[PDB]
Write a protein that holds these residues in place. Sequence first.
Motif, mmCIF file in Angstrom:
data_model
loop_
_atom_site.group_PDB
_atom_site.id
_atom_site.type_symbol
_atom_site.label_atom_id
_atom_site.label_comp_id
_atom_site.label_asym_id
_atom_site.label_seq_id
_atom_site.Cartn_x
_atom_site.Cartn_y
_atom_site.Cartn_z
ATOM 1 N N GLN C 84 30.177 15.694 -12.586
ATOM 2 C CA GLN C 84 31.029 16.871 -12.572
ATOM 3 C C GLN C 84 31.452 17.036 -11.128
ATOM 4 N N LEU C 85 32.396 17.945 -10.883
ATOM 5 C CA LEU C 85 33.494 17.849 -9.906
ATOM 6 C C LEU C 85 33.140 17.052 -8.654
ATOM 7 N N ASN C 86 32.193 17.485 -7.830
ATOM 8 C CA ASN C 86 31.694 16.671 -6.732
ATOM 9 C C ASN C 86 30.190 16.508 -6.797
ATOM 10 N N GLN C 87 29.566 16.983 -7.868
ATOM 11 C CA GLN C 87 28.119 17.018 -7.997
ATOM 12 C C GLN C 87 27.674 15.832 -8.835
ATOM 13 N N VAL C 88 26.911 14.942 -8.220
ATOM 14 C CA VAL C 88 26.290 13.817 -8.899
ATOM 15 C C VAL C 88 24.889 13.695 -8.320
ATOM 16 N N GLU C 89 23.968 13.151 -9.101
ATOM 17 C CA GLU C 89 22.643 12.871 -8.573
ATOM 18 C C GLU C 89 22.682 11.557 -7.810
ATOM 19 N N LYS C 90 22.492 11.632 -6.500
ATOM 20 C CA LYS C 90 22.367 10.448 -5.670
ATOM 21 C C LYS C 90 20.917 10.001 -5.660
ATOM 22 N N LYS C 91 20.705 8.692 -5.638
ATOM 23 C CA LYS C 91 19.356 8.159 -5.660
ATOM 24 C C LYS C 91 19.303 6.882 -4.841
ATOM 25 N N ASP C 92 18.091 6.511 -4.450
ATOM 26 C CA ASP C 92 17.880 5.394 -3.549
ATOM 27 C C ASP C 92 17.688 4.102 -4.327
ATOM 28 N N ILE C 93 18.352 3.049 -3.864
ATOM 29 C CA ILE C 93 18.309 1.727 -4.474
ATOM 30 C C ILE C 93 17.552 0.821 -3.515
ATOM 31 N N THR C 94 16.587 0.066 -4.031
ATOM 32 C CA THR C 94 15.859 -0.907 -3.229
ATOM 33 C C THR C 94 15.980 -2.279 -3.868
ATOM 34 N N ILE C 95 16.465 -3.249 -3.106
ATOM 35 C CA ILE C 95 16.427 -4.646 -3.512
ATOM 36 C C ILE C 95 15.250 -5.295 -2.807
ATOM 37 N N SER C 96 14.614 -6.254 -3.473
ATOM 38 C CA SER C 96 13.386 -6.834 -2.935
ATOM 39 C C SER C 96 13.237 -8.258 -3.442
ATOM 40 N N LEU C 97 13.353 -9.233 -2.544
ATOM 41 C CA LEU C 97 13.078 -10.621 -2.893
ATOM 42 C C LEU C 97 11.589 -10.814 -3.144
ATOM 43 N N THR C 98 11.248 -11.405 -4.286
ATOM 44 C CA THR C 98 9.861 -11.571 -4.694
ATOM 45 C C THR C 98 9.551 -13.034 -4.966
ATOM 46 N N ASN C 99 8.284 -13.284 -5.278
ATOM 47 C CA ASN C 99 7.831 -14.582 -5.744
ATOM 48 C C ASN C 99 7.987 -14.667 -7.259
ATOM 49 N N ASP C 100 7.540 -15.780 -7.835
ATOM 50 C CA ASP C 100 7.557 -15.937 -9.281
ATOM 51 C C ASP C 100 6.535 -15.005 -9.915
ATOM 52 N N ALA C 101 6.984 -14.238 -10.914
ATOM 53 C CA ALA C 101 6.223 -13.162 -11.558
ATOM 54 C C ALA C 101 5.732 -12.161 -10.512
ATOM 55 N N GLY C 102 6.712 -11.448 -9.955
ATOM 56 C CA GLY C 102 6.582 -10.734 -8.700
ATOM 57 C C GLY C 102 5.486 -9.699 -8.583
ATOM 58 N N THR C 103 4.436 -10.081 -7.861
ATOM 59 C CA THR C 103 3.370 -9.184 -7.446
ATOM 60 C C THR C 103 3.339 -9.049 -5.934
ATOM 61 N N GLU C 104 4.356 -9.565 -5.252
ATOM 62 C CA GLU C 104 4.331 -9.710 -3.804
ATOM 63 C C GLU C 104 5.770 -9.752 -3.326
ATOM 64 N N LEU C 105 6.146 -8.830 -2.449
ATOM 65 C CA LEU C 105 7.504 -8.795 -1.931
ATOM 66 C C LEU C 105 7.593 -9.637 -0.669
ATOM 67 N N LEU C 106 8.745 -10.266 -0.471
ATOM 68 C CA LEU C 106 8.981 -11.074 0.716
ATOM 69 C C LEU C 106 9.932 -10.401 1.694
ATOM 70 N N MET C 107 11.007 -9.805 1.189
ATOM 71 C CA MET C 107 11.931 -9.008 1.975
ATOM 72 C C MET C 107 12.299 -7.779 1.164
ATOM 73 N N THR C 108 12.812 -6.758 1.842
ATOM 74 C CA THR C 108 13.171 -5.519 1.165
ATOM 75 C C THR C 108 14.371 -4.898 1.857
ATOM 76 N N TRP C 109 15.390 -4.561 1.075
ATOM 77 C CA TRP C 109 16.524 -3.773 1.525
ATOM 78 C C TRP C 109 16.434 -2.388 0.906
ATOM 79 N N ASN C 110 16.855 -1.376 1.654
ATOM 80 C CA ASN C 110 16.801 0.002 1.186
ATOM 81 C C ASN C 110 18.164 0.640 1.364
#
Lengths: 148, 148, 148, 50
Positions: C84-110
């Motif tokens: 609605q007019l200028n009101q939207v819920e903004k939220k934080d997006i995180t990308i994260s390079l992981t290993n196979d079956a990711g239990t461990e992050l290697l890099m992280t963008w925020n």
Amino acid sequence: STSTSQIAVEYPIPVYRFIVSVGDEKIPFNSVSGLDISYDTIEYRDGVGNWFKMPGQSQSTNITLRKGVFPGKTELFDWINSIQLNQVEKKDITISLTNDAGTELLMTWNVSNAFPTSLTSPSFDATSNDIAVQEITLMADRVIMQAV
Amino acid sequence: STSTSQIAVEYPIPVYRFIVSVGDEKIPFNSVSGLDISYDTIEYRDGVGNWFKMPGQSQSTNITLRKGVFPGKTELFDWINSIQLNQVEKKDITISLTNDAGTELLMTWNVSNAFPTSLTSPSFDATSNDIAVQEITLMADRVIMQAV
Amino acid sequence: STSTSQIAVEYPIPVYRFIVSVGDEKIPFNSVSGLDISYDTIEYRDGVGNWFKMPGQSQSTNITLRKGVFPGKTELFDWINSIQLNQVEKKDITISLTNDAGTELLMTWNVSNAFPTSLTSPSFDATSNDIAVQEITLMADRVIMQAV
Amino acid sequence: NWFKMPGQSQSTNITLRKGVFPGKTELFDWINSIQLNQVEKKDITISLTN
């Protein structure tokens, strides 16, 4: 049964064998580009219907010479490095189509008062099988083409 | 029968072996781009016919360095993150074509006062077989090319 | 003979394994694009010859996330429908390079304060063997890259 | 007959442009020193160089 002296008179000239000479030096170049004449056209048109087309103001000649990077020699760079404010040494460039192991010219182009702008450094690239090449760009006037 | 010391003098230099050194650090880069000189041209033309062409105002140097993402190290990012309002640490970048297992430089480019704009993050892509790479872009002045 | 713990320290990170987390939710995405820093450059130049180059005003961050259409779930659409007019819920997006079956992050963008513009519907096509995919575009500020 | 002559000269008005530097205001201190009609006048030289 074409004789070998008939081919020297009747056949077109291949581009790949040429001599470039920058001032007093002559230096081997990989490719030469640009180097063409051009003219603006002036058009007058009046109400009774006649339409005059004229050749107009000539355009500035822009040449691009391409050359690989050799380990001891930077004399394309030292020419463009010597530019202080508007003072540069302009010199004449001659391209000349030759025969194999050139002792005989077939065609000749002459460029007057060429000076360098925009020397292009090689693109270093770890996954490429190429030679380091450089383009220098020349602004000049009066391309003329000479027979032999 | 070319001797191996003749090839060091006469033959062109391949691009793929190079050393990049950013300030006091030296860091391995995948590719380096840009890094060329350029000049505007000033043209005077008066009525009697003579046409003056001059080298003019120099153009700003814009370099693009490309590098893969390694798991412990972000020191391309920490350089561009340190930009407060107009204050950034500028540092000198040197590219240098070398031999195999470089103990000997063949050519050297020098960049002065380079500072980062536009660090490019990798494009995450579930159907791609590539390494995470990053381009950093540098604005600088005075590319000079040094022999050896 | 490289050990398997040496590859975790020395080798570059492949792009294709990553985790995207939009706010409190985490949702599987096909590809992430954009997400780069950029800066305008301010150039002062006066008559005595010195030329100042500065980092200037930062640019707005524009991200494009791509995702296939799944039969029960539209929560990329419900986010962009709630404007609605200028009101939207903004939220934080995180990308994260992981290993196979990711239990461990290697890099992280925020990414901070991301809100949706331009949700793209799939192109229905009777002669195509593809999945229905959707791109959502996000405008945000402050991409930061975190080690591990 | 029509006589044309050069006449009274006109006053010279110059505009100098300069960026703002963090320690230095000596363009401002010159214009701030104007008391009623008393200001320090000084000579300006422009010079094209290499």
